[PDB]
Write a protein that binds this DNA or RNA. Sequence first.
RNA 1: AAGUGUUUAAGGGCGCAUGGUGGAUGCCUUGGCACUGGGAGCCGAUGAAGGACGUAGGAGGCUGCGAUAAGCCUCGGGG
RNA 2: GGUGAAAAGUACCCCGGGAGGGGAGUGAAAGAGUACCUGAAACCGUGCGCUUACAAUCCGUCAGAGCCCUCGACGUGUCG
RNA 3: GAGUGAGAAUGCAGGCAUGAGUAGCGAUUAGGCAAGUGAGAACCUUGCCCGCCGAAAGACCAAGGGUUCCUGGGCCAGGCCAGUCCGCCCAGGGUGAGUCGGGACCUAAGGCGAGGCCGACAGGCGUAGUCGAUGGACAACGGGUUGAUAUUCCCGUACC
RNA 4: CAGACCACGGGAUUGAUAGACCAGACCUGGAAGCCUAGUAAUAGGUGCAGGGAACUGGCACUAACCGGCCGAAAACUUAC
Lengths: 54, 46, 118, 114
Amino acid sequence: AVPKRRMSRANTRSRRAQWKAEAPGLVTVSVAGQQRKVPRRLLKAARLGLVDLD
Amino acid sequence: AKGKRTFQPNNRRRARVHGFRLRMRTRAGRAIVANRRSKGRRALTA
Amino acid sequence: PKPTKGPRLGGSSSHQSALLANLATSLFEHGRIKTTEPKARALRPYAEKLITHAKKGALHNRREVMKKIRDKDVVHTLFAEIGPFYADRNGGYTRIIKVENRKGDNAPMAVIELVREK
Amino acid sequence: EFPSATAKARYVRVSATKARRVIDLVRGKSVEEALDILRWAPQAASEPVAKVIASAAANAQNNEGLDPSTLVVATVYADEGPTAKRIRPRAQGRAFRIRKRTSHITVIVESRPP
RNA sequence: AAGUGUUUAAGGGCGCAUGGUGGAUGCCUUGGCACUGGGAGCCGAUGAAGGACGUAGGAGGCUGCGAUAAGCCUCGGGG
RNA sequence: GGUGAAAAGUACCCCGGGAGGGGAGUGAAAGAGUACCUGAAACCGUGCGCUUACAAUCCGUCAGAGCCCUCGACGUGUCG
RNA sequence: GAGUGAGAAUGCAGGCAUGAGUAGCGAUUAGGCAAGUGAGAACCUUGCCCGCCGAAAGACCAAGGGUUCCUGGGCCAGGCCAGUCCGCCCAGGGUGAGUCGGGACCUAAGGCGAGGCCGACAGGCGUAGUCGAUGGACAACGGGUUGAUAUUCCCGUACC
RNA sequence: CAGACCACGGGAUUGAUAGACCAGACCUGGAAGCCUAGUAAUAGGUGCAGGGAACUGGCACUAACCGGCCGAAAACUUAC
């Protein structure tokens, strides 16, 4: 089937607002003296030096 | 399948069926060459 | 070990078996292989069970690890170094560390290591 | 008005909507926090946004002589840019239009008090 | 105890402010159109019309030119 | 088709790999930056004000509380 | 004096929305790891494994394409992602024949066709000729070589 | 054993949540090696052997982490 009518801008906007990214939760880690922020999942990798903290 | 497309290229056949010598052979072809020249086409024939 | 619940890792059962064999080979060869997180999770049991065969010195376990691994260098490595190395450790021979996602398809990545405290 | 710095990454090869998807994660945030969020955000459109924000902070530090720690992304928005029109051939020899969209990402960072 | 009342915005709407895209509008023009008055009213085997390939110290297009190849000679204008 | 009168088309700083930008400069103008006169609408943002998650809406119109701004007045914050 | 007023012509052109950040991302082989390069790497390089074709998905001709080949650079466009890679982009280089395949040899079908015959004209035919390979005749084989050419170049030995 | 996602339900070191390991239960049906009977195919012993997934119980050996974001109140009238 095909859209029978142009969707009103209100409906378009309301449905399009649902396409959004979730902000990653950032945890502090101590690497090389300075403090960096990485996902808690990568916290162990950062501690073990496995994360390329630019 | 049999997916042979219509244009099967062949340069000899192209030249002998649409080429300059063919076009100049007959009155109609000479007229076509002259009409094409009058239009200004760069490629008067094959 | 426990089969794969969902669709198999490589794209088929045979390719998953081959992929687990190759990942186990690399894991035993380097001690540290980076691969997509689901591959690492599937490999942890596979590799730990090969190491279980290697931990006990027997020609029968030699042949079992061989019918899994098919890499004589790494089979010797197992049965000579990694066998006696885990003589006292009872399970959990390896470790999974989740690392950044792959920039290409944003896949979850994880490194599998062999444990080395004792 | 708090002192401010601008930075316009123009003709970025990212659809304006996708640039906005990542801008919303950071608008109003500190510059440091915005850069961390963009660093760990899966969205590939985050790299252009992070570069625009970093350029805004760099302009603040150098051209405006502001303290970086006091900067927050005050107003960041991505506008549509020129669209290239390509053709995708489809079944029964029907040509559909593909739109290679671009975006102008404008960042304006303000030096707010602690 | 029973009644009276906030204030939410995930999103949406409207107005305004600011932009982006886009290339309308205004004002133009290198081009075109329609004519006026004149000249020429033919060119070609002394090879035409029209081209191909070359030709500049340097890659192509246009222009010119033709292995004497953006040119050769003579006579005039010009500074 | 249209930068500018003139290319004066950003010697040398900064962020970036680049793109692009912020400085600084030229310019009468950069609200003219070889994407360039003017720069409409469609369309896409962002900011602010009001409004909306008990509601059945050809999306307006007429009454219209509330809220937010503006012009006067009186010079109490309330009336026009 | 009018190209004088558009909202409709499944009107025409350009720019844009809606659908929608959606379907799809093109078979029936399948990738993985390590290490490099890089700003960036699932996709490039190398190594090792794994797997796929193997009367081919291998090798080479012809047609066709036309520089796509090689070297060095580039990564804005294209590649259905990204790309440091590329059949993309830029410059330079690169194709060597007495024997190979053609012509200079020959004809078939067919074409054209001096005169010519036929036809109001235009022209239709066609003899002699003349072209016309897909055929007939016709002298070269091994090895090596470059980043790109090889029965061509080179070496050795043959043949017009 | 909850499930398209999300959600729901457990665990998160003060832990048995998952994996591994150790057992067991099951499935298969007698592993490899060696020895013996064999001119050999093969057979017998070692040996309810060996291989193993989902079920069960043990076991912190591996991973549940030196963490992060949210998240609590104008009052007033009347009676008691």
